Every structure is written in structure tokens, then in C-alpha cells.
Amino acid sequence: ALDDIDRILVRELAADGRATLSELATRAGLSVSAVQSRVRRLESRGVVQGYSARINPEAVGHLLSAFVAITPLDPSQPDDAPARLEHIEEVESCYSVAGEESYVLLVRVASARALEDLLQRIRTTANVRTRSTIILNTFYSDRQHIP
């Protein structure tokens, strides 16, 4: 249910999430009130899920980032795993995945020793084995595409 006007707003808000209603208005050719109300409607269906500053993880001390694939040590209860790892703050994302493993997390930590410690917390808190792939370099990311 997304018309061309909304297509223009989200593409803009993707590029600039601090875009102002007035800047948006003159870009879709609408009144600042038209825009405001459009934007909240986008927001309240779950088309826009929030706004975030995109922080440099190295600058705040996260020098090591890794993908960790996790699989149930044994898969008989439905899966707690996302729920119970929500309160580990160093886990940034959590996807279920088709194939041999069940979830893939992306994880951000200060150093190698801090990674080893974190893998222990993960193994123990969701009762899961882990396969780790360290990121050496991010070429670009969250480059959100609106068609």
C-alpha cells in the first residue's frame, strides 16, 4: 500500500533521517502538515521502524566485529535463542537462516580476548554451538535501497 509520495519520503529519510519536514515538503511538493501526517502514518504501519545515528564502531572502542552462526545443542523446545540473547548488548543483529545453522548474529567486541569471553556467554546463555567468522574490514553497509 505505498504511493509515489511515500516512496519519495522514505528514500529521503533513508538518505537523511534528520531531513526536516520543511525540506521534505518542498521535495514532495506538499505542505509541511501533509508531510508530517504522511510520515507518522509510515511510522505507525511499520514502514519506518525508528531513526538512528550511524555510529563508527571503531571510534567507540569496538575494534573487532564478527558474524557468529549458532545452532541448538539440542533443538527440541521451540527456540529461546533470540529472546534470551536480547539482553547481551554486544549482539547487534540476529537472523534465523536456512541451512545447517539456525541463527546468524553480528557481534561487536573490544578485542580477541573479549571475543572469546563473549562466545562463552553466548554458548552458555542460549545453549548453542557457535561458528565464528571475524570481519577484517567493512567496505560499506546499511546502504538501504528503495525501488
Ligand X SMILES: N[C@@H](Cc1c[nH]c2ccccc12)C(=O)O
Q: How far is the CB of 107 from a second copy (least distance, A)?
A: 10
Which listed option, a second copy, ligand X, none, makes contact with residue 79 (CB within 5 to 8 Å by class)? ligand X
Q: 79 or 117, CB closer to ligand X?
A: 79
Distance CA 40, CA 53 (A): 19
CB of 70 to a second copy, least distance (A): 12
For residue 147, what is the DSSP state? -
Report, in Å, the least distance between residue 11 CB and a second copy: 9
Residues near ligand X (CB under 6 A)? 72, 75, 79, 96, 98-99, 101-102, 136
DSSP SS3 for 65: strand
The backbone torsions φ and ψ at residue 67, rounded to the nearest 5 degrees and listed phi first, read -95, 130
The four Cα atoms 77, 83, 89, 94 give a dihedral, to 10 degrees, of 80
Partner from a second copy, ligand X, none binding residue 95, C-beta < 5-8 Å depending on class: a second copy
Binding site for a second copy (CB under 8 A): 2, 7, 10, 13-18, 45-57, 59-62, 67, 82, 86, 89-99, 103-104, 106, 108, 110, 133-147
Q: Are 116 and 90 in contact (CB under 8 A)?
A: no
Nearer to ligand X, 53 or 136 (CB): 136
